[PDB]
Amino acid sequence: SVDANKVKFFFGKNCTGESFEYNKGETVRFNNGDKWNDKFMSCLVGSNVRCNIWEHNEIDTPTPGKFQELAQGSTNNDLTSINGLSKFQVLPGAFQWAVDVKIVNKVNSTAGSYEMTITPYQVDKVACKDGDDFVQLPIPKLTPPDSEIVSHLTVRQTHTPYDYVVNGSVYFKYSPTTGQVTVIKKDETFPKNMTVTQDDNTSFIFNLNSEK
């Protein structure tokens, strides 16, 4: 059986082949280079845990890439029409979507001396350093879902001299059409020292060229 509170993956039609287990509130982005990604064939989802399966991800193309929200509880026995796999996101039945963010040393050499702490609209602050697999921020359905979300961003050193590197705000938003995630950045809130580029759908990468 599948847990109501966890999810599990099956590497053959009719829950066969190989078997895999997954925690709630986890995001895993495989590459087309690993055949172990295309090994996806079945899966099983509890009842209090969302699952999100994406194959194509783009941010200018007019053709909507293959996307499917796996129902918060069900079995997935034949889903070849989903186009195999490339990205999976598991949500703890509490967030409608989530977003991966990571820092990148564009000034330092070790990298593991900086920490980014971001706090969207009354969300649990999450502190990540240059030594993680893109920290996941929990985002509700909002109202409306195409509405923007205020987020304070504070980048500070993990250790001495413990100085502040960035102390500004950023706007996040998703398009409730194909799970398209986007970031709005304007001189009204956005700082002038760190920038963020959309390395993939739901996957952002912040580059730190300054050293405040």
mmCIF file with all atom_site columns, C-alpha atoms in Angstrom:
data_model
loop_
_atom_site.group_PDB
_atom_site.id
_atom_site.type_symbol
_atom_site.label_atom_id
_atom_site.label_alt_id
_atom_site.label_comp_id
_atom_site.label_asym_id
_atom_site.label_entity_id
_atom_site.label_seq_id
_atom_site.pdbx_PDB_ins_code
_atom_site.Cartn_x
_atom_site.Cartn_y
_atom_site.Cartn_z
_atom_site.occupancy
_atom_site.B_iso_or_equiv
_atom_site.pdbx_formal_charge
_atom_site.auth_seq_id
_atom_site.auth_comp_id
_atom_site.auth_asym_id
_atom_site.auth_atom_id
_atom_site.pdbx_PDB_model_num
ATOM 1   C CA . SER A 1 1   ? 0.000  0.000  0.000   1.00 0.00 ? 1   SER A CA 1
ATOM 2   C CA . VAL A 1 2   ? 0.894  3.724  -0.320  1.00 0.00 ? 2   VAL A CA 1
ATOM 3   C CA . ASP A 1 3   ? 1.056  5.835  2.877   1.00 0.00 ? 3   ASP A CA 1
ATOM 4   C CA . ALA A 1 4   ? -1.558 8.660  3.136   1.00 0.00 ? 4   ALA A CA 1
ATOM 5   C CA . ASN A 1 5   ? 1.423  10.918 4.114   1.00 0.00 ? 5   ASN A CA 1
ATOM 6   C CA . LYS A 1 6   ? 4.188  9.764  1.620   1.00 0.00 ? 6   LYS A CA 1
ATOM 7   C CA . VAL A 1 7   ? 4.457  8.693  -2.072  1.00 0.00 ? 7   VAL A CA 1
ATOM 8   C CA . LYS A 1 8   ? 6.161  5.820  -3.965  1.00 0.00 ? 8   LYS A CA 1
ATOM 9   C CA . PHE A 1 9   ? 7.374  5.313  -7.543  1.00 0.00 ? 9   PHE A CA 1
ATOM 10  C CA . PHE A 1 10  ? 7.165  2.148  -9.682  1.00 0.00 ? 10  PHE A CA 1
ATOM 11  C CA . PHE A 1 11  ? 9.536  1.398  -12.552 1.00 0.00 ? 11  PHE A CA 1
ATOM 12  C CA . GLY A 1 12  ? 7.131  -0.794 -14.584 1.00 0.00 ? 12  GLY A CA 1
ATOM 13  C CA . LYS A 1 13  ? 3.450  -0.772 -15.743 1.00 0.00 ? 13  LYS A CA 1
ATOM 14  C CA . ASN A 1 14  ? 1.040  -2.262 -13.118 1.00 0.00 ? 14  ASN A CA 1
ATOM 15  C CA . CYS A 1 15  ? 3.370  -1.417 -10.123 1.00 0.00 ? 15  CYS A CA 1
ATOM 16  C CA . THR A 1 16  ? 6.242  -3.716 -11.360 1.00 0.00 ? 16  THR A CA 1
ATOM 17  C CA . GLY A 1 17  ? 10.007 -3.624 -12.186 1.00 0.00 ? 17  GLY A CA 1
ATOM 18  C CA . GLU A 1 18  ? 11.831 -1.531 -9.541  1.00 0.00 ? 18  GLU A CA 1
ATOM 19  C CA . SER A 1 19  ? 10.391 0.296  -6.477  1.00 0.00 ? 19  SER A CA 1
ATOM 20  C CA . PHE A 1 20  ? 11.236 3.706  -4.954  1.00 0.00 ? 20  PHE A CA 1
ATOM 21  C CA . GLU A 1 21  ? 10.066 5.754  -1.905  1.00 0.00 ? 21  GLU A CA 1
ATOM 22  C CA . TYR A 1 22  ? 9.527  9.511  -1.425  1.00 0.00 ? 22  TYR A CA 1
ATOM 23  C CA . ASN A 1 23  ? 8.996  11.930 1.474   1.00 0.00 ? 23  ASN A CA 1
ATOM 24  C CA . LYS A 1 24  ? 6.262  14.633 1.424   1.00 0.00 ? 24  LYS A CA 1
ATOM 25  C CA . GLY A 1 25  ? 7.560  18.172 0.590   1.00 0.00 ? 25  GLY A CA 1
ATOM 26  C CA . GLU A 1 26  ? 10.449 17.145 -1.762  1.00 0.00 ? 26  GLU A CA 1
ATOM 27  C CA . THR A 1 27  ? 11.432 18.240 -5.326  1.00 0.00 ? 27  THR A CA 1
ATOM 28  C CA . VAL A 1 28  ? 13.585 16.088 -7.648  1.00 0.00 ? 28  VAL A CA 1
ATOM 29  C CA . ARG A 1 29  ? 14.701 17.305 -11.106 1.00 0.00 ? 29  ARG A CA 1
ATOM 30  C CA . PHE A 1 30  ? 16.324 14.615 -13.231 1.00 0.00 ? 30  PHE A CA 1
ATOM 31  C CA . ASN A 1 31  ? 18.160 15.244 -16.535 1.00 0.00 ? 31  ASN A CA 1
ATOM 32  C CA . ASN A 1 32  ? 17.456 13.578 -19.932 1.00 0.00 ? 32  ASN A CA 1
ATOM 33  C CA . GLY A 1 33  ? 21.123 12.333 -19.709 1.00 0.00 ? 33  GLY A CA 1
ATOM 34  C CA . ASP A 1 34  ? 20.183 9.862  -16.901 1.00 0.00 ? 34  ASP A CA 1
ATOM 35  C CA . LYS A 1 35  ? 18.140 6.980  -18.492 1.00 0.00 ? 35  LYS A CA 1
ATOM 36  C CA . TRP A 1 36  ? 16.945 6.323  -14.878 1.00 0.00 ? 36  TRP A CA 1
ATOM 37  C CA . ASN A 1 37  ? 14.618 9.347  -15.453 1.00 0.00 ? 37  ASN A CA 1
ATOM 38  C CA . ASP A 1 38  ? 12.885 7.700  -18.486 1.00 0.00 ? 38  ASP A CA 1
ATOM 39  C CA . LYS A 1 39  ? 12.666 4.495  -16.311 1.00 0.00 ? 39  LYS A CA 1
ATOM 40  C CA . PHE A 1 40  ? 9.512  6.128  -14.802 1.00 0.00 ? 40  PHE A CA 1
ATOM 41  C CA . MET A 1 41  ? 6.441  4.039  -15.844 1.00 0.00 ? 41  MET A CA 1
ATOM 42  C CA . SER A 1 42  ? 4.069  3.938  -12.796 1.00 0.00 ? 42  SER A CA 1
ATOM 43  C CA . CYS A 1 43  ? 3.599  5.670  -9.417  1.00 0.00 ? 43  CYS A CA 1
ATOM 44  C CA . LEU A 1 44  ? 1.355  5.672  -6.316  1.00 0.00 ? 44  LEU A CA 1
ATOM 45  C CA . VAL A 1 45  ? 0.126  8.742  -4.378  1.00 0.00 ? 45  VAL A CA 1
ATOM 46  C CA . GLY A 1 46  ? -1.422 8.643  -0.864  1.00 0.00 ? 46  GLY A CA 1
ATOM 47  C CA . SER A 1 47  ? -4.301 11.085 -0.156  1.00 0.00 ? 47  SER A CA 1
ATOM 48  C CA . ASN A 1 48  ? -2.764 14.033 1.812   1.00 0.00 ? 48  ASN A CA 1
ATOM 49  C CA . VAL A 1 49  ? 0.253  14.472 -0.571  1.00 0.00 ? 49  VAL A CA 1
ATOM 50  C CA . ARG A 1 50  ? 0.252  16.187 -4.029  1.00 0.00 ? 50  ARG A CA 1
ATOM 51  C CA . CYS A 1 51  ? 2.471  14.958 -6.871  1.00 0.00 ? 51  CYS A CA 1
ATOM 52  C CA . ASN A 1 52  ? 3.461  17.068 -9.916  1.00 0.00 ? 52  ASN A CA 1
ATOM 53  C CA . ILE A 1 53  ? 4.884  15.532 -13.149 1.00 0.00 ? 53  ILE A CA 1
ATOM 54  C CA . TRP A 1 54  ? 6.476  17.752 -15.836 1.00 0.00 ? 54  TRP A CA 1
ATOM 55  C CA . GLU A 1 55  ? 8.405  16.742 -19.010 1.00 0.00 ? 55  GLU A CA 1
ATOM 56  C CA . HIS A 1 56  ? 8.956  20.050 -20.871 1.00 0.00 ? 56  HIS A CA 1
ATOM 57  C CA . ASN A 1 57  ? 9.831  23.409 -19.295 1.00 0.00 ? 57  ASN A CA 1
ATOM 58  C CA . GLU A 1 58  ? 10.179 26.756 -21.177 1.00 0.00 ? 58  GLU A CA 1
ATOM 59  C CA . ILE A 1 59  ? 9.530  30.551 -20.780 1.00 0.00 ? 59  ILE A CA 1
ATOM 60  C CA . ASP A 1 60  ? 8.904  32.084 -24.261 1.00 0.00 ? 60  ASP A CA 1
ATOM 61  C CA . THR A 1 61  ? 7.550  29.145 -26.376 1.00 0.00 ? 61  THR A CA 1
ATOM 62  C CA . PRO A 1 62  ? 3.822  29.363 -27.417 1.00 0.00 ? 62  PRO A CA 1
ATOM 63  C CA . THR A 1 63  ? 3.301  25.524 -27.334 1.00 0.00 ? 63  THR A CA 1
ATOM 64  C CA . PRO A 1 64  ? 2.252  24.413 -23.786 1.00 0.00 ? 64  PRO A CA 1
ATOM 65  C CA . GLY A 1 65  ? 4.756  21.672 -22.771 1.00 0.00 ? 65  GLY A CA 1
ATOM 66  C CA . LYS A 1 66  ? 3.525  18.344 -21.300 1.00 0.00 ? 66  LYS A CA 1
ATOM 67  C CA . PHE A 1 67  ? 2.381  18.875 -17.697 1.00 0.00 ? 67  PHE A CA 1
ATOM 68  C CA . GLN A 1 68  ? 0.098  16.897 -15.335 1.00 0.00 ? 68  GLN A CA 1
ATOM 69  C CA . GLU A 1 69  ? -0.905 17.387 -11.696 1.00 0.00 ? 69  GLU A CA 1
ATOM 70  C CA . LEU A 1 70  ? -1.023 13.873 -10.183 1.00 0.00 ? 70  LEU A CA 1
ATOM 71  C CA . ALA A 1 71  ? -4.193 13.785 -8.013  1.00 0.00 ? 71  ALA A CA 1
ATOM 72  C CA . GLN A 1 72  ? -3.589 14.192 -4.233  1.00 0.00 ? 72  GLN A CA 1
ATOM 73  C CA . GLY A 1 73  ? -4.651 10.511 -3.810  1.00 0.00 ? 73  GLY A CA 1
ATOM 74  C CA . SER A 1 74  ? -4.719 7.882  -6.655  1.00 0.00 ? 74  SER A CA 1
ATOM 75  C CA . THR A 1 75  ? -2.768 5.097  -8.469  1.00 0.00 ? 75  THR A CA 1
ATOM 76  C CA . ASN A 1 76  ? -0.923 5.740  -11.763 1.00 0.00 ? 76  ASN A CA 1
ATOM 77  C CA . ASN A 1 77  ? -0.784 2.504  -13.813 1.00 0.00 ? 77  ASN A CA 1
ATOM 78  C CA . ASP A 1 78  ? -0.507 3.685  -17.469 1.00 0.00 ? 78  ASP A CA 1
ATOM 79  C CA . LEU A 1 79  ? 0.517  7.337  -18.041 1.00 0.00 ? 79  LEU A CA 1
ATOM 80  C CA . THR A 1 80  ? 2.725  7.138  -21.225 1.00 0.00 ? 80  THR A CA 1
ATOM 81  C CA . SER A 1 81  ? 0.615  10.108 -22.535 1.00 0.00 ? 81  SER A CA 1
ATOM 82  C CA . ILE A 1 82  ? 2.392  12.293 -19.852 1.00 0.00 ? 82  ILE A CA 1
ATOM 83  C CA . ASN A 1 83  ? 5.537  11.864 -22.119 1.00 0.00 ? 83  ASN A CA 1
ATOM 84  C CA . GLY A 1 84  ? 7.705  9.860  -19.642 1.00 0.00 ? 84  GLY A CA 1
ATOM 85  C CA . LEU A 1 85  ? 9.293  12.202 -17.000 1.00 0.00 ? 85  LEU A CA 1
ATOM 86  C CA . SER A 1 86  ? 11.928 14.906 -16.354 1.00 0.00 ? 86  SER A CA 1
ATOM 87  C CA . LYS A 1 87  ? 10.824 16.767 -13.156 1.00 0.00 ? 87  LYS A CA 1
ATOM 88  C CA . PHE A 1 88  ? 8.873  15.629 -10.091 1.00 0.00 ? 88  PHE A CA 1
ATOM 89  C CA . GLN A 1 89  ? 7.594  17.735 -7.142  1.00 0.00 ? 89  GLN A CA 1
ATOM 90  C CA . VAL A 1 90  ? 5.901  16.239 -4.038  1.00 0.00 ? 90  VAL A CA 1
ATOM 91  C CA . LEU A 1 91  ? 3.882  18.600 -1.779  1.00 0.00 ? 91  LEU A CA 1
ATOM 92  C CA . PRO A 1 92  ? 2.707  17.863 1.840   1.00 0.00 ? 92  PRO A CA 1
ATOM 93  C CA . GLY A 1 93  ? -1.022 18.501 1.029   1.00 0.00 ? 93  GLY A CA 1
ATOM 94  C CA . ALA A 1 94  ? -0.473 22.018 2.479   1.00 0.00 ? 94  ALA A CA 1
ATOM 95  C CA . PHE A 1 95  ? 1.118  24.026 -0.406  1.00 0.00 ? 95  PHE A CA 1
ATOM 96  C CA . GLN A 1 96  ? -0.410 24.326 -3.942  1.00 0.00 ? 96  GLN A CA 1
ATOM 97  C CA . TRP A 1 97  ? 3.073  24.665 -5.483  1.00 0.00 ? 97  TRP A CA 1
ATOM 98  C CA . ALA A 1 98  ? 6.641  25.280 -4.364  1.00 0.00 ? 98  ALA A CA 1
ATOM 99  C CA . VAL A 1 99  ? 9.787  26.885 -5.828  1.00 0.00 ? 99  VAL A CA 1
ATOM 100 C CA . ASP A 1 100 ? 13.449 25.874 -5.805  1.00 0.00 ? 100 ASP A CA 1
ATOM 101 C CA . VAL A 1 101 ? 16.085 28.600 -5.146  1.00 0.00 ? 101 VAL A CA 1
ATOM 102 C CA . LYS A 1 102 ? 19.926 28.334 -4.866  1.00 0.00 ? 102 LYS A CA 1
ATOM 103 C CA . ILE A 1 103 ? 22.827 30.787 -4.473  1.00 0.00 ? 103 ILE A CA 1
ATOM 104 C CA . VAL A 1 104 ? 25.904 30.841 -6.778  1.00 0.00 ? 104 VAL A CA 1
ATOM 105 C CA . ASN A 1 105 ? 29.273 32.396 -5.944  1.00 0.00 ? 105 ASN A CA 1
ATOM 106 C CA . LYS A 1 106 ? 29.966 35.012 -8.685  1.00 0.00 ? 106 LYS A CA 1
ATOM 107 C CA . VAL A 1 107 ? 32.500 36.753 -6.334  1.00 0.00 ? 107 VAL A CA 1
ATOM 108 C CA . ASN A 1 108 ? 33.748 34.106 -3.799  1.00 0.00 ? 108 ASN A CA 1
ATOM 109 C CA . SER A 1 109 ? 35.753 30.829 -4.365  1.00 0.00 ? 109 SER A CA 1
ATOM 110 C CA . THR A 1 110 ? 34.610 28.366 -1.597  1.00 0.00 ? 110 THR A CA 1
ATOM 111 C CA . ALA A 1 111 ? 30.946 29.547 -1.962  1.00 0.00 ? 111 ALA A CA 1
ATOM 112 C CA . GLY A 1 112 ? 29.989 27.844 1.399   1.00 0.00 ? 112 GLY A CA 1
ATOM 113 C CA . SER A 1 113 ? 30.286 31.162 3.351   1.00 0.00 ? 113 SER A CA 1
ATOM 114 C CA . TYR A 1 114 ? 26.926 32.759 2.332   1.00 0.00 ? 114 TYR A CA 1
ATOM 115 C CA . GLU A 1 115 ? 23.311 32.099 3.414   1.00 0.00 ? 115 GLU A CA 1
ATOM 116 C CA . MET A 1 116 ? 20.098 33.245 1.649   1.00 0.00 ? 116 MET A CA 1
ATOM 117 C CA . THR A 1 117 ? 17.010 33.579 3.870   1.00 0.00 ? 117 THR A CA 1
ATOM 118 C CA . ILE A 1 118 ? 13.717 34.302 2.063   1.00 0.00 ? 118 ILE A CA 1
ATOM 119 C CA . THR A 1 119 ? 10.308 35.009 3.590   1.00 0.00 ? 119 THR A CA 1
ATOM 120 C CA . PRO A 1 120 ? 7.269  35.115 1.239   1.00 0.00 ? 120 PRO A CA 1
ATOM 121 C CA . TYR A 1 121 ? 3.830  36.453 2.455   1.00 0.00 ? 121 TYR A CA 1
ATOM 122 C CA . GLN A 1 122 ? 3.606  35.119 6.077   1.00 0.00 ? 122 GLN A CA 1
ATOM 123 C CA . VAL A 1 123 ? 5.562  31.889 5.221   1.00 0.00 ? 123 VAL A CA 1
ATOM 124 C CA . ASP A 1 124 ? 8.087  29.951 7.385   1.00 0.00 ? 124 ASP A CA 1
ATOM 125 C CA . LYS A 1 125 ? 11.504 31.618 6.743   1.00 0.00 ? 125 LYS A CA 1
ATOM 126 C CA . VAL A 1 126 ? 13.982 29.189 5.105   1.00 0.00 ? 126 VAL A CA 1
ATOM 127 C CA . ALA A 1 127 ? 17.754 29.682 5.341   1.00 0.00 ? 127 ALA A CA 1
ATOM 128 C CA . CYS A 1 128 ? 19.911 27.962 2.671   1.00 0.00 ? 128 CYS A CA 1
ATOM 129 C CA . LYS A 1 129 ? 23.703 28.128 2.082   1.00 0.00 ? 129 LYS A CA 1
ATOM 130 C CA . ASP A 1 130 ? 25.947 27.325 -0.948  1.00 0.00 ? 130 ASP A CA 1
ATOM 131 C CA . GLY A 1 131 ? 25.887 23.559 -0.189  1.00 0.00 ? 131 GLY A CA 1
ATOM 132 C CA . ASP A 1 132 ? 22.269 22.446 -0.925  1.00 0.00 ? 132 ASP A CA 1
ATOM 133 C CA . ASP A 1 133 ? 20.109 20.959 -3.768  1.00 0.00 ? 133 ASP A CA 1
ATOM 134 C CA . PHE A 1 134 ? 18.048 24.179 -4.336  1.00 0.00 ? 134 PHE A CA 1
ATOM 135 C CA . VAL A 1 135 ? 15.984 24.965 -1.159  1.00 0.00 ? 135 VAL A CA 1
ATOM 136 C CA . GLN A 1 136 ? 12.202 24.624 -1.630  1.00 0.00 ? 136 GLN A CA 1
ATOM 137 C CA . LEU A 1 137 ? 9.882  27.527 -0.628  1.00 0.00 ? 137 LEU A CA 1
ATOM 138 C CA . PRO A 1 138 ? 6.243  26.610 0.201   1.00 0.00 ? 138 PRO A CA 1
ATOM 139 C CA . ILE A 1 139 ? 3.675  28.739 -1.718  1.00 0.00 ? 139 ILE A CA 1
ATOM 140 C CA . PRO A 1 140 ? -0.167 28.504 -1.212  1.00 0.00 ? 140 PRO A CA 1
ATOM 141 C CA . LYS A 1 141 ? -2.780 28.676 -4.045  1.00 0.00 ? 141 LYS A CA 1
ATOM 142 C CA . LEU A 1 142 ? -3.013 32.469 -3.297  1.00 0.00 ? 142 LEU A CA 1
ATOM 143 C CA . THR A 1 143 ? -6.179 34.488 -4.146  1.00 0.00 ? 143 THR A CA 1
ATOM 144 C CA . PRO A 1 144 ? -6.254 34.931 -7.124  1.00 0.00 ? 144 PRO A CA 1
ATOM 145 C CA . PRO A 1 145 ? -3.579 32.313 -8.079  1.00 0.00 ? 145 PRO A CA 1
ATOM 146 C CA . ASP A 1 146 ? -2.196 34.667 -10.803 1.00 0.00 ? 146 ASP A CA 1
ATOM 147 C CA . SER A 1 147 ? -1.657 37.307 -8.019  1.00 0.00 ? 147 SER A CA 1
ATOM 148 C CA . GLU A 1 148 ? 1.919  38.279 -7.035  1.00 0.00 ? 148 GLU A CA 1
ATOM 149 C CA . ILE A 1 149 ? 3.463  37.449 -3.585  1.00 0.00 ? 149 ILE A CA 1
ATOM 150 C CA . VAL A 1 150 ? 5.692  39.856 -1.583  1.00 0.00 ? 150 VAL A CA 1
ATOM 151 C CA . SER A 1 151 ? 8.940  38.178 -0.405  1.00 0.00 ? 151 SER A CA 1
ATOM 152 C CA . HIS A 1 152 ? 11.753 39.686 1.686   1.00 0.00 ? 152 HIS A CA 1
ATOM 153 C CA . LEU A 1 153 ? 15.262 38.386 0.729   1.00 0.00 ? 153 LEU A CA 1
ATOM 154 C CA . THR A 1 154 ? 18.153 38.655 3.215   1.00 0.00 ? 154 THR A CA 1
ATOM 155 C CA . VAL A 1 155 ? 21.548 37.232 2.234   1.00 0.00 ? 155 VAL A CA 1
ATOM 156 C CA . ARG A 1 156 ? 24.058 37.161 5.135   1.00 0.00 ? 156 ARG A CA 1
ATOM 157 C CA . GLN A 1 157 ? 27.360 35.354 5.819   1.00 0.00 ? 157 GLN A CA 1
ATOM 158 C CA . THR A 1 158 ? 27.067 31.966 7.688   1.00 0.00 ? 158 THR A CA 1
ATOM 159 C CA . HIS A 1 159 ? 30.034 32.936 9.958   1.00 0.00 ? 159 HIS A CA 1
ATOM 160 C CA . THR A 1 160 ? 32.356 35.898 10.874  1.00 0.00 ? 160 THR A CA 1
ATOM 161 C CA . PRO A 1 161 ? 32.291 38.823 10.113  1.00 0.00 ? 161 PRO A CA 1
ATOM 162 C CA . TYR A 1 162 ? 28.525 37.895 9.814   1.00 0.00 ? 162 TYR A CA 1
ATOM 163 C CA . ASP A 1 163 ? 27.895 40.932 7.508   1.00 0.00 ? 163 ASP A CA 1
ATOM 164 C CA . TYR A 1 164 ? 24.723 41.515 5.405   1.00 0.00 ? 164 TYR A CA 1
ATOM 165 C CA . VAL A 1 165 ? 25.224 40.972 1.615   1.00 0.00 ? 165 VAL A CA 1
ATOM 166 C CA . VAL A 1 166 ? 21.652 41.627 0.336   1.00 0.00 ? 166 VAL A CA 1
ATOM 167 C CA . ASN A 1 167 ? 18.687 43.194 2.209   1.00 0.00 ? 167 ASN A CA 1
ATOM 168 C CA . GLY A 1 168 ? 15.792 43.773 -0.259  1.00 0.00 ? 168 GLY A CA 1
ATOM 169 C CA . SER A 1 169 ? 12.557 42.237 -1.643  1.00 0.00 ? 169 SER A CA 1
ATOM 170 C CA . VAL A 1 170 ? 11.439 40.192 -4.669  1.00 0.00 ? 170 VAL A CA 1
ATOM 171 C CA . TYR A 1 171 ? 8.042  39.305 -6.187  1.00 0.00 ? 171 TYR A CA 1
ATOM 172 C CA . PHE A 1 172 ? 7.096  35.692 -7.012  1.00 0.00 ? 172 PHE A CA 1
ATOM 173 C CA . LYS A 1 173 ? 4.081  34.551 -9.125  1.00 0.00 ? 173 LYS A CA 1
ATOM 174 C CA . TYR A 1 174 ? 2.917  31.448 -11.022 1.00 0.00 ? 174 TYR A CA 1
ATOM 175 C CA . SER A 1 175 ? 0.678  31.106 -14.099 1.00 0.00 ? 175 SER A CA 1
ATOM 176 C CA . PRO A 1 176 ? -2.147 28.662 -13.020 1.00 0.00 ? 176 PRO A CA 1
ATOM 177 C CA . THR A 1 177 ? -2.258 27.193 -16.601 1.00 0.00 ? 177 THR A CA 1
ATOM 178 C CA . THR A 1 178 ? 0.766  24.792 -16.900 1.00 0.00 ? 178 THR A CA 1
ATOM 179 C CA . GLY A 1 179 ? 2.434  25.164 -13.433 1.00 0.00 ? 179 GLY A CA 1
ATOM 180 C CA . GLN A 1 180 ? 4.582  27.949 -14.962 1.00 0.00 ? 180 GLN A CA 1
ATOM 181 C CA . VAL A 1 181 ? 6.660  29.674 -12.221 1.00 0.00 ? 181 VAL A CA 1
ATOM 182 C CA . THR A 1 182 ? 8.000  33.248 -12.716 1.00 0.00 ? 182 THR A CA 1
ATOM 183 C CA . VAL A 1 183 ? 9.721  36.058 -10.740 1.00 0.00 ? 183 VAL A CA 1
ATOM 184 C CA . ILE A 1 184 ? 8.912  39.773 -10.989 1.00 0.00 ? 184 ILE A CA 1
ATOM 185 C CA . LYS A 1 185 ? 11.835 42.121 -10.204 1.00 0.00 ? 185 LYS A CA 1
ATOM 186 C CA . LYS A 1 186 ? 11.675 45.937 -10.206 1.00 0.00 ? 186 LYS A CA 1
ATOM 187 C CA . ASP A 1 187 ? 13.737 48.817 -8.715  1.00 0.00 ? 187 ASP A CA 1
ATOM 188 C CA . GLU A 1 188 ? 10.769 49.431 -6.305  1.00 0.00 ? 188 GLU A CA 1
ATOM 189 C CA . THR A 1 189 ? 11.883 46.291 -4.281  1.00 0.00 ? 189 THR A CA 1
ATOM 190 C CA . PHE A 1 190 ? 14.645 44.372 -6.186  1.00 0.00 ? 190 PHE A CA 1
ATOM 191 C CA . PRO A 1 191 ? 18.278 44.991 -5.039  1.00 0.00 ? 191 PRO A CA 1
ATOM 192 C CA . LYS A 1 192 ? 21.306 45.927 -7.271  1.00 0.00 ? 192 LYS A CA 1
ATOM 193 C CA . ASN A 1 193 ? 24.009 43.377 -6.279  1.00 0.00 ? 193 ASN A CA 1
ATOM 194 C CA . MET A 1 194 ? 22.448 39.873 -6.655  1.00 0.00 ? 194 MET A CA 1
ATOM 195 C CA . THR A 1 195 ? 20.275 38.765 -9.625  1.00 0.00 ? 195 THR A CA 1
ATOM 196 C CA . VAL A 1 196 ? 18.147 35.656 -10.292 1.00 0.00 ? 196 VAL A CA 1
ATOM 197 C CA . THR A 1 197 ? 17.777 33.801 -13.592 1.00 0.00 ? 197 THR A CA 1
ATOM 198 C CA . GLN A 1 198 ? 15.248 31.102 -14.458 1.00 0.00 ? 198 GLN A CA 1
ATOM 199 C CA . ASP A 1 199 ? 17.535 28.070 -14.826 1.00 0.00 ? 199 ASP A CA 1
ATOM 200 C CA . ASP A 1 200 ? 14.364 25.895 -15.335 1.00 0.00 ? 200 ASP A CA 1
ATOM 201 C CA . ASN A 1 201 ? 10.587 25.941 -14.639 1.00 0.00 ? 201 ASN A CA 1
ATOM 202 C CA . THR A 1 202 ? 10.074 26.062 -10.788 1.00 0.00 ? 202 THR A CA 1
ATOM 203 C CA . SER A 1 203 ? 13.937 26.294 -10.544 1.00 0.00 ? 203 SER A CA 1
ATOM 204 C CA . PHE A 1 204 ? 15.701 29.602 -9.871  1.00 0.00 ? 204 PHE A CA 1
ATOM 205 C CA . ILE A 1 205 ? 19.424 30.329 -9.487  1.00 0.00 ? 205 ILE A CA 1
ATOM 206 C CA . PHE A 1 206 ? 20.622 33.507 -7.710  1.00 0.00 ? 206 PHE A CA 1
ATOM 207 C CA . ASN A 1 207 ? 24.061 34.850 -8.786  1.00 0.00 ? 207 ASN A CA 1
ATOM 208 C CA . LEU A 1 208 ? 26.039 37.056 -6.327  1.00 0.00 ? 208 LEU A CA 1
ATOM 209 C CA . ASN A 1 209 ? 28.464 39.347 -8.227  1.00 0.00 ? 209 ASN A CA 1
ATOM 210 C CA . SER A 1 210 ? 28.772 41.941 -5.354  1.00 0.00 ? 210 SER A CA 1
ATOM 211 C CA . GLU A 1 211 ? 30.255 41.593 -1.806  1.00 0.00 ? 211 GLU A CA 1
ATOM 212 C CA . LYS A 1 212 ? 28.473 44.049 0.589   1.00 0.00 ? 212 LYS A CA 1
#
